[PDB]
Structures are given as C-alpha cells and as structure tokens.
C-alpha cells in the first residue's frame, strides 16, 4: 500500500508513486524525476494526470511512450495551480529535470517535498525564502555523518586533468565512462570538451540524452563510436573482463583504456582525499572510482534544513529500517536544538 510518506495531506496529490496501482483518492501524480526507482510502474497505459518538468516530460513521452495527454509539463519557478492548488516546481540540484515541489495548502500549510536533491546555498536565495515552510519531505540518502565528499566542481577537475593527461602521453589511449541512468553527465562533457572529442554511445543512451534540453548538443554527441575518442557504456561494463572485451571491438584503434566509475559514496571517503585517488590497473586498463554525487552531503543537508526551520520533517529515503528511522530523528533533534527552532 501507497505509504504515508508519498501523500500531501489535504491534497489528492502523490509523489513518486506510481508502483501500487491506482492509489485511493488520487487526482494527480507527481513525478520529481526520471529515476526507476521513482517512476516504477509508469508506462504507456498509465491512464491518471502526471505532473513534472519539461525535461522529465520529454523522457516519458519519448522513453516510456507514455501518451501526451496524461503529461502535464509546468516551468520552474512559476507558480502554478493545479486542481485548485498553488504549487511552484524548484530545481533540485540533482539529475536532468529532477525537481522539489512547493505545495500552498488551502488551510494556510506549507510543505515543501524534495523529491532527489543535493542541497546548495544557492536555494536560500529561491522562492524558499519568500515564506515560512511547515512540512519538509527530505532526501535523507546521506543523513549520518560519516558522509562526506568533495564539491562537483573538484570531482570535474581531477577527472578532465587526469584524462587529459592519460591521452596527452599516450594518444592511442581510450576513455570509457560508466552510466546506468540519468544524471552526472558533466563527467563525460566535460571529459570530452578537454580531449577535443563528442562522446559515443549507443543508440539508447543518445536518444535518452536528446530529451534532456542540453545547449548545442549535438555538437557535443554522437551515435559513431569510431569517430570519438569518449565512450560511455553500460556501468556493468565497466570492469577488466568487459573493457578487455570492448577495447577488441574497436578494431586496433586504441592500445589503453582509462575508465571512469562516478560512484555515490564509498567507505574511501573516510580515509583518501581527491588529490589523493589511485585506479585499479591490470595492465593496459585503469579504472577510477570518482566520488560524483548528486544528492546532499551530511553537512549540505544539515545547512538547509537549519536555514529552512522546518516545523515537522518526514524522511522519504532509509525508511524502511526503525535503527534508520530512529538515528536520523536523532540528528533533526540535535539540528533543531542547535539552532533553535
Ligand atoms: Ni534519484
């Protein structure tokens, strides 16, 4: 059953929930971004309101196939009513398209939901600021200390300047990126952009990336691998067995393969600083791990919700455990004390 969690009390609306039937009482669906997790269940016989961003639209017209007329798309920073309801979409900060939701209740309440987000200053100055939020429906993916990593803009750093490198002294040398989803494309342009190449993908990735509103980009991609010295592939593909294989399939063309796997966080964190990230090398294959995250850090969350002083705050993400549960209603008491709201 739809839990508490996904429901705007005082509303017919839900958020992100589209894997338990039709929901009791649901006169719209919102959808905060084009994630599986979030979207499961949606398709082209989806037959209920969905409202999201243009960029999300675009992904389920063109890649679910879902029919135009259950798609309501809505601009950013605009306030907008929806079944009698004032509602404004915000960038999250997270994927292409991802967005938070700021709900006006008839009643006077005010909630904000996150869906996805990396928390960032830059949100202090939106429409947040215009008035008081009483209910925050937060993206606790990182809410425990031990959370740490380094900003987007340090992580894009040592990724151009170690492939740049790479190719400089070995230009028959290949970069290869990971990616199963949406999200955390600046690694491959920006990797791109240093080395003078548009990046190649399969036909799948390329049609995925044309939906998403990217300036000049199709200067910037291609479906011809053989003419672009940036592949992405597939993130199971990216270990020694199946680089190996795929440095066959370009035909003598390149001798090396530096490869990139952006993941979330992992227990390095704690210990390796950027300046400081060695690969895992079987002979003429490397395979860096980089930190790129798009949600909060411990310490971004705790920032903006102690600038927010949210009322009540319901956790959307590690709900499922009450050892979860419990620790993170001990870090809101501790931010809320802190700060004295
Ligand atoms: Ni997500």
């Given at each position: 059953?739809?839990?508490?969690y ?17 929901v ?30 243009e ?19 809505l ?12 509602v404004?979409?915000?960038?999250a ?18 909630i ?13 100055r ?6 008081k ?8 993916t ?17 990724a151009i ?5 790479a ?8 970069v ?12 491959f ?10 990046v190649?993908?399969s ?21 011809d ?8 592939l597939?993130?199971?593909q ?11 399939k ?31 090398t ?32 319901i ?6 455990t ?6 993170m ?11 004295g709201?």
């Amino acid at each position: 059953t739809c839990p508490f969690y996904k429901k705007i009390p005082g509303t017919g609306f839900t958020v992100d929930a589209f894997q338990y039937g039709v929901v009791e009482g649901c006169t719209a669906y919102f959808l905060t971004h084009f994630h599986s997790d979030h979207y499961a269940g949606l398709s082209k016989h989806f037959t209920f309101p969905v409202y999201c961003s243009e960029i999300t639209g675009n992904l389920l017209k063109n890649k679910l196939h879902v029919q135009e007329q259950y798609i309501h798309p809505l601009p950013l920073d605009t306030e907008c009513i929806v079944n009698g309801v004032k509602v404004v979409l915000l960038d999250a900060n997270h994927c292409p398209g991802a967005v938070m939701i700021l709900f006006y209740l008839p009643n006077g309440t005010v909630i904000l939901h996150t869906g996805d987000f990396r928390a960032d200053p830059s949100m202090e100055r939106s429409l947040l600021a215009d008035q008081k939020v009483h209910m925050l429906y937060l993206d606790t993916t990182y809410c425990s200390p031990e959370y740490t990593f380094p900003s987007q803009q340090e992580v894009i750093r040592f990724a151009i300047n170690t492939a740049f490198e790479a190719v400089t002294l070995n230009p028959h040398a290949l970069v290869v990126c990971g990616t199963y989803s949406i999200g955390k494309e600046k690694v491959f342009l920006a990797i791109a952009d240093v080395l003078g190449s548009k990046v190649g993908m399969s036909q799948e990735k390329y049609k995925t990336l044309q939906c998403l509103n990217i300036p000049e980009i199709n200067s910037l991609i291609t479906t011809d691998m053989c003419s672009s010295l940036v592949h992405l592939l597939p993130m199971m593909q990216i270990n020694f067995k199946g680089l190996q294989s795929h440095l066959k399939k370009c035909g003598g063309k390149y001798n090396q393969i530096l490869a990139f796997r952006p993941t979330g966080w992992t227990h390095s964190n704690k210990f390796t600083r950027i300046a400081d990230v060695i690969p895992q090398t079987k002979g003429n294959i490397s395979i860096y791990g980089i930190p790129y995250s798009e949600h909060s850090s411990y310490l971004e969350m705790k920032r903006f919700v102690q600038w927010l002083k949210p009322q009540k705050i319901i956790p959307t993400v590690n709900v499922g455990t009450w050892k979860s549960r419990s620790t993170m209603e001990k870090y809101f008491r501790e931010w809320k004390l802190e700060a004295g709201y």
